[PDB]
């Protein structure tokens, strides 16, 4: 899965 | 786990200092992979790795989809309630 930092 | 209410107090000039992976379009929730040392999720003390993150700010994300949670969490600001929970 995707991933983001935020 | 238990389902949680958790605050986070963050200023404008940072993130929330989380990485988020998952989203509906997995068929997985928004999960915590990350929680960045000394930014405000860390601060807050009650965001851990691993935790679905529900809702925010009342914003229900059980059913969103990956780049919709960024956007809905990027845009809340100052004193943020989170709704978690451990699985």
């Given at each position: ?6 | ?12 000039h940072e993130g929330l ?30 965001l851990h790795v691993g ?37």
């Amino acid at each position: 899965w995707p991933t983001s930092k935020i | 786990g238990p389902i949680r209410k958790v605050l986070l107090l963050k200023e404008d000039h940072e993130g929330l200092g989380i990485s988020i992976t998952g989203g509906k379009e997995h068929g997985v929730p928004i999960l915590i992979s990350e929680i960045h040392p000394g930014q405000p999720a860390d601060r807050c003390g009650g965001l851990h790795v691993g935790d679905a993150i529900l809702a925010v700010n009342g914003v229900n994300l059980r059913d969103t989809k990956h780049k919709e949670a960024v956007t809905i969490l990027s845009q809340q600001r100052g004193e943020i309630e989170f709704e978690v929970v451990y699985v």
